[PDB]
């Protein structure tokens, strides 16, 4: 036994499932309009964006 | 045809302090990592390679700059940054707000450089998100070279010291400037010097003898405006090599190899992507240019 | 029979370059209605359909490459190829009316004459497309002297990938591609990519990561190295795939060919010939778009990579050392 003593610290992780309750009408939401943007046009394919 | 737009999501509302600097630079070029519409703020800065606690190495930062795509700002909304994109080869408006100010005109040439004069001026920190944003500097191609010319000379003469007026000052017609060297990592700036020791001593082996004899006929009496480097005295080495007789077909094989290795010195003195400006407005500070490929 | 001629009325008038945008001023602001492909944000609905976006797909960019037509001896160009190989136009002197010399990278491995262990795969394959190496050495008698003074990288003009090759007994026609994506002849609506043998290609960006930025571009580089084996001059051609930009890869290619620089230049402590100092050259074979996966293949075996969406843009030869 050497001169000093010592403490040891860990961490621990637990996969837990969770219950989320939310009261009524807590958030007012705004929903815009979807648009289409075409870009990165190549010779085998064309990429879009919505 | 093709669209170009990058809108940047941001997780916190910006302050009125930091928005006033971003409203000041509404036309500016900053590089960013990926090619998408949505983008995190941790790619917008140049400071992923140049942070405060990390010692910056401006050659490696400039080496970083040719990889990335470059982008121009459109608006600064108080939540989302909105940018437009630069692709080779596309004509686009560019507007210089860049603080160590130089003057451009129509039919000029440009380059993009890391900030080499004032980092605190050319970088703004965002205390709301904790991540800082670093702006590069756009420079005409003559001073685009001439700043890199001084920084390669500087790492040569900081290693010999193991004073400042000759090593840290970039010269130009009308103005002198101060390079920002307090903390520089020389190891990526010395591998460029490691290849310079390769090219330059090969060029000292295949030296044309007649073009050495030309200076022995020139600088002793014939004084010219651009030969004031030698100050009127021949170097001691040049008298030693000229003992051989001249012959034409020796130098014909030599001067082609002298020619072919100066093709290689493009690769070590490269800038970033270049910008050939065709039309520049003066009072509006706008311009028009096509982005060159790397 | 004019219904067959009515087909050419459709296809030729349908396939043209777009005409110049010229509207007289007396018509008014009708010219703004004649600008459709600059519009790039199309409206969407709750349930969009093709009939809502058949106008959106109609504007497409203008892409047409410029082909090359080569008339080759049937001995030099091996009669069977995987239809996407890379090419070279070697040129010495116009001696005939129209005869041309073309070099696949399997063929240039045979004129080289390097050791088997440098490329352990293609040596078996390139040994059965040709003879022992004198079937092609008869056409260039200066292959000893073109290596000494170092003029061989000045005589190659990189061409690109194949498109079509109609083969006869004595004369083989080769249709090559420049400026970009060559249209496939036999399969309609297909595109010929560039294929390299897996042995010749040397990747450059490879990390643990132990981060590099993305982009739109990655540039295939050609390389060609003068060296000496068995005290006889010989060449070595390697490829590179990197998007690091030209300022890095010249320093990166020096680290790949470190040993080749060292084993040669032990010789010149004794004899210093200025003609011998030239070492290698690097061309630019054109860009590749990002994140396209190179797909491995197998031919006869011979593993062969492939690059979809390849476009070609040839460059100069610059002498690195």
UniProtKB/Swiss-Prot annotation, chain A:
It is found in: Virion; Host nucleus. Self-assembles to form an icosahedral capsid with a T=16 symmetry, about 200 nm in diameter, and consisting of 150 hexons and 12 pentons (total of 162 capsomers). Hexons form the edges and faces of the capsid and are each composed of six MCP molecules. In contrast, one penton is found at each of the 12 vertices. Eleven of the pentons are MCP pentamers, while the last vertex is occupied by the portal complex. Homomultimer. Makes the hexons and eleven out of twelve pentons. Interacts with triplex proteins 1/TRX1 and 2/TRX2; adjacent capsomers are linked together in groups of three by triplexes, heterotrimeric complexes composed of one molecule of TRX1 and two molecules of TRX2. Interacts with scaffold protein; this interaction allows efficient MCP transport to the host nucleus. Interacts with capsid vertex component 2/CVC2. Interacts with the small capsomere-interacting protein/SCP. Belongs to the herpesviridae major capsid protein family. This is Major capsid protein. It comes from Human herpesvirus 8 type P (isolate GK18) (HHV-8). The chain holds residues 1033 to 1082 of 1376 of the full protein.
């Amino acid at each position: 036994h050497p001169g000093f003593a010592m403490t040891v610290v860990r961490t621990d992780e637990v996969l837990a499932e969770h219950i989320l309750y939310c009261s009524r009408a807590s958030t007012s939401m705004f929903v815009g309009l979807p648009s289409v943007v075409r870009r990165e046009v190549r010779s085998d394919a064309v990429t879009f964006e919505i | 045809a093709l669209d170009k737009s990058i809108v940047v999501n941001l997780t916190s509302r910006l302050f009125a302090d930091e928005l006033a600097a971003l409203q000041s630079k509404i036309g500016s070029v900053l590089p960013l990592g990926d090619c998408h519409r949505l983008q995190n703020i941790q790619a917008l800065g140049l400071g992923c390679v140049c942070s405060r606690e990390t010692s910056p190495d401006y050659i490696q930062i400039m080496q970083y700059l040719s990889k990335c795509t470059l982008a121009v700002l459109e608006e600064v909304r108080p939540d989302s940054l909105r940018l437009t994109r630069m692709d080779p080869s596309d004509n686009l408006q560019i507007k210089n707000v860049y603080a160590p100010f130089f003057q451009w005109d129509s039919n000029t040439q440009l380059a993009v450089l890391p900030p080499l004069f004032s980092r605190k001026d050319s970088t703004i920190v965002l205390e709301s998100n904790g991540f800082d944003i670093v702006f590069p500097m756009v420079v005409p191609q003559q001073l685009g070279h001439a700043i890199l010319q001084q920084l390669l000379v500087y790492h040569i003469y900081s290693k010999i010291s193991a004073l400042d007026l000759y090593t840290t000052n970039v010269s130009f017609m009308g103005r002198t400037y101060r390079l920002d060297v307090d903390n520089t990592d020389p190891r990526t700036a010395l591998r460029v010097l490691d290849d310079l020791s390769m090219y330059l001593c090969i060029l000292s082996a295949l030296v044309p003898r007649g073009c050495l004899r030309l200076l022995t006929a020139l600088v002793r009496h014939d004084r010219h405006p651009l030969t004031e480097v030698f100050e009127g005295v021949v170097p001691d080495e040049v008298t030693r090599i000229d003992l051989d007789q001249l012959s034409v077909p020796d130098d014909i094989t030599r001067m082609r190899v002298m020619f072919s290795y100066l093709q290689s010195l493009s690769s070590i003195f490269n800038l970033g992507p270049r910008l050939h400006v065709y039309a520049y407005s003066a009072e509006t500070l706008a311009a028009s240019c096509w982005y060159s490929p790397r | 029979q004019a219904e067959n001629a009515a087909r050419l009325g459709r296809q030729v008038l349908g396939l043209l370059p777009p005409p110049t945008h010229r509207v007289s001023l007396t018509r008014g602001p009708e010219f703004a209605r004649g600008v459709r492909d600059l519009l790039s944000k199309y409206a969407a609905s709750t349930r969009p359909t093709v009939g809502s976006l058949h106008e959106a797909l109609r504007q497409a960019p203008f892409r047409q490459p410029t082909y090359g037509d080569f008339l080759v001896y049937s001995q030099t160009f091996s009669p069977q190829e995987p239809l996407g190989t890379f090419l070279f136009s070697f040129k010495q002197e116009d001696n005939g009316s129209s005869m041309d010399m073309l070099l696949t990278p399997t063929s240039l491995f045979m004129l080289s004459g390097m050791e088997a262990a440098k490329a352990p795969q293609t040596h078996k394959v390139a040994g059965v497309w040709y003879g022992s190496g004198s079937g092609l050495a008869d056409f260039i008698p200066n292959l000893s002297e073109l290596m000494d003074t170092g003029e061989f990288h000045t005589l190659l003009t990189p061409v690109g990938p194949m498109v079509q090759s109609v083969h006869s007994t004595f004369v083989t026609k080769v249709t090559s591609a420049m400026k970009g994506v060559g249209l496939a002849r036999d399969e309609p609506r297909a595109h010929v990519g560039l294929t390299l043998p897996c042995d010749m290609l040397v990747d450059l960006d490879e990390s643990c990561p132990m981060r590099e930025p993305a982009g739109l571009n990655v540039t295939i580089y050609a390389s060609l190295v003068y060296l000496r084996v068995n005290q006889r001059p010989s060449m070595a051609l390697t490829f590179f795939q990197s998007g690091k930009g030209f300022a890095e890869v010249v320093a990166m290619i020096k680290d790949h060919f470190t040993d080749v620089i060292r084993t040669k230049y032990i010789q010149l402590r004794h004899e210093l010939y200025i003609n011998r100092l030239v070492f290698g050259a690097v061309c630019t074979l054109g860009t590749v778009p990002f994140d396209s996966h190179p797909v491995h293949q197998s031919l006869n075996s011979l593993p062969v990579l492939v690059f979809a969406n390849f476009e070609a843009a040839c460059g100069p030869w610059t002498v690195f050392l």
